[PDB]
PDB file of all heavy atoms in Angstrom:
ATOM      1  N   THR Y  32      -7.792  26.453   4.483  1.00  2.50           N
ATOM      2  CA  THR Y  32      -8.859  25.813   5.287  1.00  2.50           C
ATOM      3  C   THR Y  32     -10.120  25.607   4.491  1.00  2.50           C
ATOM      4  O   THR Y  32     -11.260  25.755   5.061  1.00  2.50           O
ATOM      5  CB  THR Y  32      -9.170  26.584   6.544  1.00  2.50           C
ATOM      6  OG1 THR Y  32      -9.827  27.865   6.195  1.00  2.50           O
ATOM      7  CG2 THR Y  32      -7.851  26.878   7.336  1.00  2.50           C
ATOM      8  N   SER Y  35     -14.235  21.681   1.277  1.00  2.00           N
ATOM      9  CA  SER Y  35     -15.097  21.029   0.257  1.00  2.00           C
ATOM     10  C   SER Y  35     -14.780  21.610  -1.104  1.00  2.00           C
ATOM     11  O   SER Y  35     -15.642  22.080  -1.815  1.00  2.00           O
ATOM     12  CB  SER Y  35     -16.563  21.283   0.634  1.00  2.00           C
ATOM     13  OG  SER Y  35     -16.880  22.640   0.588  1.00  2.00           O
ATOM     14  N   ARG Y  39      -8.538  21.326  -4.148  1.00  2.00           N
ATOM     15  CA  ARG Y  39      -7.538  21.749  -3.164  1.00  2.00           C
ATOM     16  C   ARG Y  39      -7.603  20.701  -2.036  1.00  2.00           C
ATOM     17  O   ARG Y  39      -8.697  20.356  -1.533  1.00  2.00           O
ATOM     18  CB  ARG Y  39      -7.851  23.117  -2.645  1.00  2.00           C
ATOM     19  CG  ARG Y  39      -7.968  24.175  -3.680  1.00  2.00           C
ATOM     20  CD  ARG Y  39      -8.386  25.508  -3.062  1.00  2.00           C
ATOM     21  NE  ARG Y  39      -7.491  25.889  -1.982  1.00  2.00           N
ATOM     22  CZ  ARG Y  39      -7.791  26.784  -1.053  1.00  2.00           C
ATOM     23  NH1 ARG Y  39      -8.968  27.390  -1.079  1.00  2.00           N
ATOM     24  NH2 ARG Y  39      -6.908  27.020  -0.097  1.00  2.00           N
ATOM     25  N   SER Y  46      -6.169  18.254  12.253  1.00  2.00           N
ATOM     26  CA  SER Y  46      -5.730  18.334  13.677  1.00  2.00           C
ATOM     27  C   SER Y  46      -4.665  17.244  13.942  1.00  2.00           C
ATOM     28  O   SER Y  46      -4.604  16.226  13.225  1.00  2.00           O
ATOM     29  CB  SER Y  46      -6.895  18.185  14.623  1.00  2.00           C
ATOM     30  OG  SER Y  46      -7.860  19.228  14.426  1.00  2.00           O
ATOM     31  N   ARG Y  59       2.982  26.788   8.916  1.00  5.09           N
ATOM     32  CA  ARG Y  59       2.748  28.198   8.642  1.00  5.09           C
ATOM     33  C   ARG Y  59       3.419  28.628   7.311  1.00  5.09           C
ATOM     34  O   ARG Y  59       2.981  29.566   6.667  1.00  5.09           O
ATOM     35  CB  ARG Y  59       3.355  29.066   9.756  1.00  5.09           C
ATOM     36  CG  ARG Y  59       2.911  28.728  11.162  1.00  5.09           C
ATOM     37  CD  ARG Y  59       1.457  29.136  11.504  1.00  5.09           C
ATOM     38  NE  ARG Y  59       1.048  28.677  12.749  1.00  5.09           N
ATOM     39  CZ  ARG Y  59      -0.110  28.922  13.358  1.00  5.09           C
ATOM     40  NH1 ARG Y  59      -0.993  29.736  12.723  1.00  5.09           N
ATOM     41  NH2 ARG Y  59      -0.430  28.422  14.513  1.00  5.09           N
TER      42      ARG Y  59
ATOM     43  N   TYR I 136      -5.678  33.293  11.324  1.00  2.00           N
ATOM     44  CA  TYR I 136      -5.397  31.848  11.288  1.00  2.00           C
ATOM     45  C   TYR I 136      -5.809  31.196  12.615  1.00  2.00           C
ATOM     46  O   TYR I 136      -6.403  30.094  12.630  1.00  2.00           O
ATOM     47  CB  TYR I 136      -3.917  31.594  11.024  1.00  2.00           C
ATOM     48  CG  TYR I 136      -3.617  30.131  10.663  1.00  2.00           C
ATOM     49  CD1 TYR I 136      -3.302  29.762   9.368  1.00  2.00           C
ATOM     50  CD2 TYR I 136      -3.660  29.118  11.643  1.00  2.00           C
ATOM     51  CE1 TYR I 136      -3.065  28.438   9.033  1.00  2.00           C
ATOM     52  CE2 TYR I 136      -3.373  27.805  11.315  1.00  2.00           C
ATOM     53  CZ  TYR I 136      -3.047  27.462  10.035  1.00  2.00           C
ATOM     54  OH  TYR I 136      -2.800  26.163   9.675  1.00  2.00           O
ATOM     55  N   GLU I 169     -14.241  15.478  18.156  1.00  2.00           N
ATOM     56  CA  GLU I 169     -13.813  16.749  17.638  1.00  2.00           C
ATOM     57  C   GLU I 169     -14.737  17.116  16.433  1.00  2.00           C
ATOM     58  O   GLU I 169     -14.880  16.353  15.519  1.00  2.00           O
ATOM     59  CB  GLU I 169     -12.350  16.715  17.153  1.00  2.00           C
ATOM     60  CG  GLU I 169     -11.882  17.976  16.433  1.00  2.00           C
ATOM     61  CD  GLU I 169     -10.465  17.960  16.003  1.00  2.00           C
ATOM     62  OE1 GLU I 169     -10.097  17.214  15.062  1.00  2.00           O
ATOM     63  OE2 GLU I 169      -9.612  18.620  16.666  1.00  2.00           O
ATOM     64  N   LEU I 176     -15.271  27.203   8.355  1.00  2.00           N
ATOM     65  CA  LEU I 176     -13.936  26.920   7.807  1.00  2.00           C
ATOM     66  C   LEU I 176     -13.802  27.407   6.365  1.00  2.00           C
ATOM     67  O   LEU I 176     -12.743  27.899   5.954  1.00  2.00           O
ATOM     68  CB  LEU I 176     -13.628  25.445   7.907  1.00  2.00           C
ATOM     69  CG  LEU I 176     -13.137  24.916   9.234  1.00  2.00           C
ATOM     70  CD1 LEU I 176     -13.052  23.414   9.276  1.00  2.00           C
ATOM     71  CD2 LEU I 176     -11.771  25.545   9.620  1.00  2.00           C
ATOM     72  N   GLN I 177     -14.845  27.270   5.566  1.00  2.00           N
ATOM     73  CA  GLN I 177     -14.829  27.685   4.173  1.00  2.00           C
ATOM     74  C   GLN I 177     -14.695  29.210   4.054  1.00  2.00           C
ATOM     75  O   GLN I 177     -13.914  29.726   3.236  1.00  2.00           O
ATOM     76  CB  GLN I 177     -16.037  27.196   3.413  1.00  2.00           C
ATOM     77  CG  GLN I 177     -16.006  27.433   1.930  1.00  2.00           C
ATOM     78  CD  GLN I 177     -17.151  26.804   1.153  1.00  2.00           C
ATOM     79  OE1 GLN I 177     -17.311  25.557   1.167  1.00  2.00           O
ATOM     80  NE2 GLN I 177     -18.020  27.627   0.579  1.00  2.00           N
ATOM     81  N   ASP I 180     -11.346  30.256   5.015  1.00  2.00           N
ATOM     82  CA  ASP I 180     -10.413  30.081   3.858  1.00  2.00           C
ATOM     83  C   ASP I 180     -10.473  31.248   2.910  1.00  2.00           C
ATOM     84  O   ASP I 180      -9.423  31.655   2.427  1.00  2.00           O
ATOM     85  CB  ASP I 180     -10.797  28.727   3.141  1.00  2.00           C
ATOM     86  CG  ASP I 180     -10.043  28.554   1.847  1.00  2.00           C
ATOM     87  OD1 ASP I 180     -10.496  29.143   0.835  1.00  2.00           O
ATOM     88  OD2 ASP I 180      -9.069  27.814   1.796  1.00  2.00           O
TER      89      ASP I 180
END
Side-chain angles (χ1 to χ4, degrees):
Chain Y
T32 70
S35 65
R39 307 174 52 198
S46 301
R59 308 284 174 177
Chain I
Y136 193 106
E169 173 178 74
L176 279 171
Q177 188 175 295
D180 171 282

